[PDB]
Amino acid sequence: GSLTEDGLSYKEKFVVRSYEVGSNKTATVETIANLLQEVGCNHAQSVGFTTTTMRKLHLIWVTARMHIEIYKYPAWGDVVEIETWCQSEGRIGTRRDWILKDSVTGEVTGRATSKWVMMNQDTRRLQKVSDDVRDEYLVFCPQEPRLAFPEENNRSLKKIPKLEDPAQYSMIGLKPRRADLDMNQHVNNVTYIGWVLESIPQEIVDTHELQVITLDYRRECQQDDVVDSLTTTTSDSQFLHLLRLSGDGQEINRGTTLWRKK
Amino acid sequence: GSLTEDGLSYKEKFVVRSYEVGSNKTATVETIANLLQEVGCNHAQSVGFSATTTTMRKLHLIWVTARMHIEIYKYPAWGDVVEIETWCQSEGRIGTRRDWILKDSVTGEVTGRATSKWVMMNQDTRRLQKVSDDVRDEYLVFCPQEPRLAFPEENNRSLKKIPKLEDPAQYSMIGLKPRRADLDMNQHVNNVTYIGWVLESIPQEIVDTHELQVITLDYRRECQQDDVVDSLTTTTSNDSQFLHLLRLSGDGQEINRGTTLWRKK
Numbered sequence: 001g002s003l004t005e006d007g008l009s010y011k012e013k014f015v016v017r018s019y020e021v022g023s024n025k026t027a028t029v030e031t032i033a034n035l036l037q038e039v040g041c042n043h044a045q046s047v048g049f050t051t052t053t054m055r056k057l058h059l060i061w062v063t064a065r066m067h068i069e070i071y072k073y074p075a076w077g078d079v080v081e082i083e084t085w086c087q088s089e090g091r092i093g094t095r096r097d098w099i100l101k102d103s104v105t106g107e108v109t110g111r112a113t114s115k116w117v118m119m120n121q122d123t124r125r126l127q128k129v130s131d132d133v134r135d136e137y138l139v140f141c142p143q144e145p146r147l148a149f150p151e152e153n154n155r156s157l158k159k160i161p162k163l164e165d166p167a168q169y170s171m172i173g174l175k176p177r178r179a180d181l182d183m184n185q186h187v188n189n190v191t192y193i194g195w196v197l198e199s200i201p202q203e204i205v206d207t208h209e210l211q212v213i214t215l216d217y218r219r220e221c222q223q224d225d226v227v228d229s230l231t232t233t234t235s236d237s238q239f240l241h242l243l244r245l246s247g248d249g250q251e252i253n254r255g256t257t258l259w260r261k262k
Numbered sequence: 263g264s265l266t267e268d269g270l271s272y273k274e275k276f277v278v279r280s281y282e283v284g285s286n287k288t289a290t291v292e293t294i295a296n297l298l299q300e301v302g303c304n305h306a307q308s309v310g311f312s313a314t315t316t317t318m319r320k321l322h323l324i325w326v327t328a329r330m331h332i333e334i335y336k337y338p339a340w341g342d343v344v345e346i347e348t349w350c351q352s353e354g355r356i357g358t359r360r361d362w363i364l365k366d367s368v369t370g371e372v373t374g375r376a377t378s379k380w381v382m383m384n385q386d387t388r389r390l391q392k393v394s395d396d397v398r399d400e401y402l403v404f405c406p407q408e409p410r411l412a413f414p415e416e417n418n419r420s421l422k423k424i425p426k427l428e429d430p431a432q433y434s435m436i437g438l439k440p441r442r443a444d445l446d447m448n449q450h451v452n453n454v455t456y457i458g459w460v461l462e463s464i465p466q467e468i469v470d471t472h473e474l475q476v477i478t479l480d481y482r483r484e485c486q487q488d489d490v491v492d493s494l495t496t497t498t499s500n501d502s503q504f505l506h507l508l509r510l511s512g513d514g515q516e517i518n519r520g521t522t523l524w525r526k527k
């Protein structure tokens with residue numbers, strides 16, 4: 001992987017692995033989201049990385065929202081190239097965008113965007129800026145707007161409502177295993193995407209392809225928490241999703257999916 | 263990745279990924295087992311397979327894992343490059359064996375080794391059968407003919423008999439179930455998921471203060487997509503030893519048994 005000529009974005013190539021594909025022998029949306037996270041980590045690493053300013057303040061970047069649109073899922077053995085960049089959005093937070101491409105043809109096979117907010121790692125309270133952490137970041141971001149989803153009032157910025165009971169479909173009693181944890185013993189953001197899709201009926205998965213997925217992160221699922229995945233058809237097939245704690249029904253995530261008939 | 267000069271083994275390099283590491287910022291045993299499976303699939307692909315022979319596809323016969331054995335000396339760190347060499351060898355009518363050697367790409371030192379026993383099973387009836395001569399000759403050409411063992415030792419751990427855990431279990435993780443991410447391209451639970459489920463019943467105190475050195479796992483019965491699993495563990499022992507049992511949450515039907523060896527950090 002490497003930073004581009006201007007040093008303001010990062011590109012990396014990935015060979016699709018045998019255990020990374022589904023029934024269609026193409027990459028799952030969860031494999032894709034893992035590769036977005038990987039090329040994001042390598043981008044931060046290549047530019048010197050959270051800044052030392054927020055390291056002392058005990059401030060961390062946390063995902064508020066993930067949005068992913070796939071046109072073609074890379075096949076097993078194919079090479080996919082992902083380009084990623086970050087950009088400030090004022091005091092609100094930061095945005096990381098991605099573009100997925102076919103390595104052989106150069107065509108765009110997918111695109112993704114994510115909204116990141118600042119949080120005190122201990123108190124879990126949001127702080128927005130605290131002092132002047134903007135200046136530390138602006139040097140590694142393009143200063144002119146560079147959007148993976150430029151369309152005025154696009155899908156990535158749509159408000160998602162709360163699913164009302166009774167849910168049409170459900171997957172209950174879902175719980176993380178050690179493989180679902182990151183290097184800090186926190187549940188991986190991609191696990192929540194898997195849990196959302198568990199309540200999608202197999203008939204849909206087998207006859208449709210997942211085109212769009214938007215997910216709002218509201219609360220962290222702990223290692224000892226149990227999750228319930230709810231889904232209701234809103235319609236191509238459209239769905240409304242809700243992940244909540246199995247006990248008190250405390251919301252952890254909400255989202256929408258768009259599926260295209262094969 | 264590529265076949266070696268003699269064309270009788272395959273090598274591939276892997277950069278350890280950020281989401282592939284644990285608390286120590288080194289590759290999990292599950293990430294390692296996924297890479298053993300990947301370099302195995304690429305070896306079959308490079309020699310013409312799509313790893314069933316012409317005769318096996320005709321007879322609805324498939325290769326199935328009977329046992330996996332893995333020994334790790336050093337877990338590759340996040341960002342490190344690990345090189346894995348794999349080869350297959352027939353063991354007469356019993357079946358075949360696939361072995362692996364993991365190495366540090368920068369120093370060339372051996373950081374791990376693994377072996378697995380594969381048996382032939384009819385895809386539809388789930389009935390095992392010995393390897394016929396016509397199938398045997400089809401894959402003998404892709405195997406070294408002189409013995410090449412990742413575990414050559416006389417009283418080696420890779421071939422030790424594993425007993426059945428007796429209730430009450432000392433530790434337990436109950437109600438474990440596969441999600442879509444745990445399935446392969448044929449909607450069958452991935453062999454690595456069973457390794458994860460075995461380790462779920464290991465107390466966190468052990469995971470945090472010890473490193474997993476050896477793991478041997480016998481595959482007895484396939485966990486279906488709608489099955490629920492219970493993970494049991496009992497300490498058998500500077501080193502900690504464990505006895506494992508994975509069984510169906512309902513009737514207690516055995517799906518796997520195994521042992522782990524942990525060394526204090």
Ligand SMILES: O=C(c1cccc(O)c1)N1CCOCC1
Nearest residue numbers: 062063064117217218219220221
């Ligand atoms: O409280 C969290 C959060 C914190 C850590 C992990 C997690 O999945 C969620 N958030 C509320 C709004 O801001 C973004 C998400």
Ligand SMILES: O=C(c1cccc(O)c1)N1CCOCC1
Nearest residue numbers: 326327328381481482483484485
């Ligand atoms: O019953 C199985 C089996 C089959 C498929 C998957 C699985 O996890 C186990 N076997 C017969 C005995 O030898 C080992 C293989």
